[PDB]
Structure 1
Amino acid sequence: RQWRLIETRKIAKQPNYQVGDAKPLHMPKERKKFPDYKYGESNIFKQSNKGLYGGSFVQFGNNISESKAKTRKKWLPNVVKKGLWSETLNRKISIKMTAKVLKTISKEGGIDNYLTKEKSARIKELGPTGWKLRYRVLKRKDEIENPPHKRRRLMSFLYPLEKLEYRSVGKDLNYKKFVELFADV
């Protein structure tokens, strides 16, 4: 097979922003939660952006009679709503799937496994939703593997002292501001 309707897609190349450079005119309010999906978000069978369609877009072709009188028809995939169990998330995740995709999931032995397969083909035939799910699972796995220590209290201890010092000079100091200051330190 091929992933033509996926890998044809192109997204505007964001310029790498240096810390000292000037701002863009429209900077967003809330930050980027998820990683950027290489292949954007489908602009044709937008039905499939909400689910795990397995790179199965709608076809259009011809109904043909005994007289060979051609008439345009479309061929939809066998989509199905299906709440499937994630071991990593410890909850079942309900989404639209192609019956094919459900079969693949069953073969691979789980939904998390399906999401996390490292092949490029899989990545292509994950949606934007599928990509987000993958990210959620992978991040959770990483957390499970590696808890922070294998600092917050120190910051909390120092904060009031820092505030007092600021006041003695003359200025007031908030927590949030303190946190912002001492993130990289």
Structure 2
Amino acid sequence: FKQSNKGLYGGSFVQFGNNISESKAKTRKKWLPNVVKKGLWSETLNRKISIKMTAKVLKTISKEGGIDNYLTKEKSARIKELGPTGWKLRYRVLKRKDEIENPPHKRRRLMSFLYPLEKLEYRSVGKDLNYKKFVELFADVPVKDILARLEDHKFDLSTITV
């Protein structure tokens, strides 16, 4: 039911069954869920999410206090209910929540100073060095030793400023 993958259907699904006349004649019919396009508000994303959802999930969202709480329910039932689209959104909500709660500092400049020294060293021996390779090589280095340049400070990437 690939139409469900594009929205939050809450596990809802199509049912194929029979229709019955007073003569008990049987003819096939389909039961389609009540799908409604609604634009809800996300507090952490600070923008209006707009996807097709069924009426039942919309009511469930109202009782759970917004889309953000709907997409962040631990109980397995919710995970199954949330389709591909819900999973990706959950990632957004959760990652953004972590970013706000966990700032990076509770190196970019250092690598900027280090780059000209290394490129000159590589050019001296006849080789070259581009920024993308510089990042790739020095991605995993925790501490850059002071071979050249001057550490005219006591930062240590801790307690910035006074």
Shift of the alpha carbon at 1:174? 0.3
Instruction: Please give the per-residue CA displacement for 1:84-115, whole angstroms capped at 9, x wherever unaligned.
Output: 00000000100000000000000000101000
Work out the CA distance in 2 between the residues paired with 1:162 and 1:63. 78
Count of residues in correspondence between the two structures:
139
Shift of the alpha carbon at 1:54? 0.2
Work out the CA distance in 1 between the residues paired with 2:121 and 2:61. 59
Work out the CA distance in 2 between the residues paired with 1:181 and 1:114. 42
Instruction: Please give the per-residue CA displacement for 1:57-93, whole angstroms capped at 9, x wherever unaligned.
Output: 1110001110110100000000000100000000010
Q: Helix, strand or coil for the counterpart of 1:66?
A: coil
Shift of the alpha carbon at 1:169? 1.2
Shift of the alpha carbon at 1:170? 1.1
Higher strand share: 2
Shift of the alpha carbon at 1:117? 0.6
Q: Helix, strand or coil for the counterpart of 2:105?
A: coil
Work out the CA distance in 2 between the residues paired with 1:100 and 1:109. 14
Work out the CA distance in 2 between the residues paired with 1:160 and 1:119. 52
Instruction: State the structure with more CA Rg.
Output: 2
Work out the CA distance in 1 between the residues paired with 2:21 and 2:99. 59
Q: Which runs of 5+ in 2 are unaligned?
A: 139-161
Q: Which runs of 5+ in 1 are unaligned?
A: 1-44
Work out the CA distance in 2 between the residues paired with 1:169 and 1:151. 27
Instruction: Please give the per-residue CA displacement for 1:41-63, whole angstroms capped at 9, x wherever unaligned.
Output: xxxx1000000000001110001
Shift of the alpha carbon at 1:181? 1.0
Q: Helix, strand or coil for the counterpart of 2:3?
A: helix
